[PDB]
Amino acid sequence: QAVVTQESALTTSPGETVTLTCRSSTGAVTTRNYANWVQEKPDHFFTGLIGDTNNRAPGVPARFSGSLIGHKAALTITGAQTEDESVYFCALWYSNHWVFGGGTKLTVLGQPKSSPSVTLFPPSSEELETNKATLVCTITDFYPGVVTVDWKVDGTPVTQGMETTQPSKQSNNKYMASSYLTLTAGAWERHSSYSCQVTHEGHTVEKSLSR
Amino acid sequence: QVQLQQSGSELVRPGASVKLSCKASGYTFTTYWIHWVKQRPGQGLEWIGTIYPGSDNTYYDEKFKNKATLTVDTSSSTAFMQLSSLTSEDSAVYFCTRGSLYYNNYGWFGYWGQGTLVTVSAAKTTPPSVYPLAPGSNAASQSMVTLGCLVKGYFPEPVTVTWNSGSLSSGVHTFPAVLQSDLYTLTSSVTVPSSTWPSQTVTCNVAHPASSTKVDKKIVPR
Numbered sequence: 218q219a220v221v222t223q224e225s226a227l228t229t230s231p232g233e234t235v236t237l238t239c240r241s242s243t244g245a246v247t248t249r250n251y252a253n254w255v256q257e258k259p260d261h262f263f264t265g266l267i268g269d270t271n272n273r274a275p276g277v278p279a280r281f282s283g284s285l286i287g288h289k290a291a292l293t294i295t296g297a298q299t300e301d302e303s304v305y306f307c308a309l310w311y312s313n314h315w316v317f318g319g320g321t322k323l324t325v326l327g328q329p330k331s332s333p334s335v336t337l338f339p340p341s342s343e344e345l346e347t348n349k350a351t352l353v354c355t356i357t358d359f360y361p362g363v364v365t366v367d368w369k370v371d372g373t374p375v376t377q378g379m380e381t382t383q384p385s386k387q388s389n390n391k392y393m394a395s396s397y398l399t400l401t402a403g404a405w406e407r408h409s410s411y412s413c414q415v416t417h418e419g420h421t422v423e424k425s426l427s428r
Numbered sequence: 429q430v431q432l433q434q435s436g437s438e439l440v441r442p443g444a445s446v447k448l449s450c451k452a453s454g455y456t457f458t459t460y461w462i463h464w465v466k467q468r469p470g471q472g473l474e475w476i477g478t479i480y481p482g483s484d485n486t487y488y489d490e491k492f493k494n495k496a497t498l499t500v501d502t503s504s505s506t507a508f509m510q511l512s513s514l515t516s517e518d519s520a521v522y523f524c525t526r527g528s529l530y531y532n533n534y535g536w537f538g539y540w541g542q543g544t545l546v547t548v549s550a551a552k553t554t555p556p557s558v559y560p561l562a563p564g565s566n567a568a569s570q571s572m573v574t575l576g577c578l579v580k581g582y583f584p585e586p587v588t589v590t591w592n593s594g595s596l597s598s599g600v601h602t603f604p605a606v607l608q609s610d611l612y613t614l615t616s617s618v619t620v621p622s623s624t625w626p627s628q629t630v631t632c633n634v635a636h637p638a639s640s641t642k643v644d645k646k647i648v649p650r
């Protein structure tokens with residue numbers, strides 16, 4: 218029940234440095250949290266990188282370095298390479314358990330940033346005819362491939378009934394995502410404002426449909 | 429030459445239990461800890477618990493105190509995880525990984541299985557119900573137009589969608605299925621120019637293997 222916190226996403230470009238932090242809800246990080254760090258590469262291949270705060274694991278490149286700066290564990294990649302686009306989770310020990318951060322996706326820029334093409338869809342009547350309704354939000358052609366997608370019905374936000382696929386690559390190496398809001402045939406007809414909001418690089422693009 | 433082997437998938441029914449295995453080789457089993465980790469898609473890693481095959485020590489994390497039970501098998505050098513009263517929420521990929529040498533925290537999460545995808549459902553082979561996705565009276569006087577098909581409530585994975593059987597192939601986008609109350613759902617869109625629709629009919633073709641079914645849906649204006 219600590220909450221270890223990492224930067225959600227981060228971008229570099231090759232050659233540059235970057236530091237990923239990781240901090241504890243419990244206050245300052247101690248040497249005895251034994252901060253590890255673990256890379257996740259596509260297709261679920263994990264590799265340990267750092268143990269005991271700053272110990273580098275056999276095989277791991279000298280670029281990768283582990284630190285403890287004031288109250289927070291860090292991981293600095295110095296010679297950032299395209300091999301390093303990946304997801305990095307720090308993990309801390311609290312006397313009797315390990316707890317992982319939620320990870321930072323690193324994106325080693327390899328192409329100019331593109332903003333998403335959002336597209337909202339109303340329920341087909343045919344679906345409505347089964348007592349159910351589903352709105353569809355299709356996000357496509359964005360880079361880096363990080364977005365958050367929030368829904369709003371009648372001005373207010375929704376936090377149960379939505380699902381969002383994690384972004385995936387498209388042949389052109391940009392990204393795509395989809396979001397599904399579900400509600401019964403009744404609910405559909407009790408509201409009016411339906412809104413799908415997609416944020417990317419701290420710019421939101423929104424689509425809404427009115428019934 | 430250090431290696432831990434996890435069987436890829438295992439499907440199991442709500443309310444039941446399951447026993448995961450992790451077949452370690454290339455090192456001295458007895459002397460290194462084994463950890464287990466939960467990963468639901470679109471979520472991070474979640475630490476479950478670790479075992480020291482030498483003399484039965486464990487630390488679990490509170491939340492899985494009584495979901496998960498952890499066991500070794502020194503002879504065959506395989507590590508085991510019992511899952512209890514499996515629910516929808518437990519559908520995750522499950523990794524085991526090798527930790528430290530002996531009682532100490534001075535090591536690493538060195539080596540990782542490739543995981544077991546544990547998928548928890550009572551679903552039976554259901555075809556998809558394909559519904560269209562037309563815009564809209566907000567009338568793009570403009571170049572292009574996007575339309576698509578929801579492919580709802582099918583199981584198991586996968587289905588496969590095409591548009592006019594391949595005639596139209598540029599600027600088609602199919603998205604990942606999502607697990608929705610025991611059944612999968614995904615969608616596909618496709619972006620044509622204005623004049624070409626509804627001028628010329630545009631249909632998506634959706635094939636679902638397991639049900640031996642395959643449907644086409646003409647996308648009609650609203």
Ligand SMILES: CCCCCCCCCC(=O)CC(=O)N[C@H]1CCNC1=O
Nearest residue numbers: 268461527528531532533534535536537
């Ligand atoms: C100052 C008291 C320390 C007591 C610690 C006992 C060891 C805990 C068991 C454990 O998690 C060992 C292990 O596998 N550690 C790995 C995990 C990643 N980095 C490690 O060192």
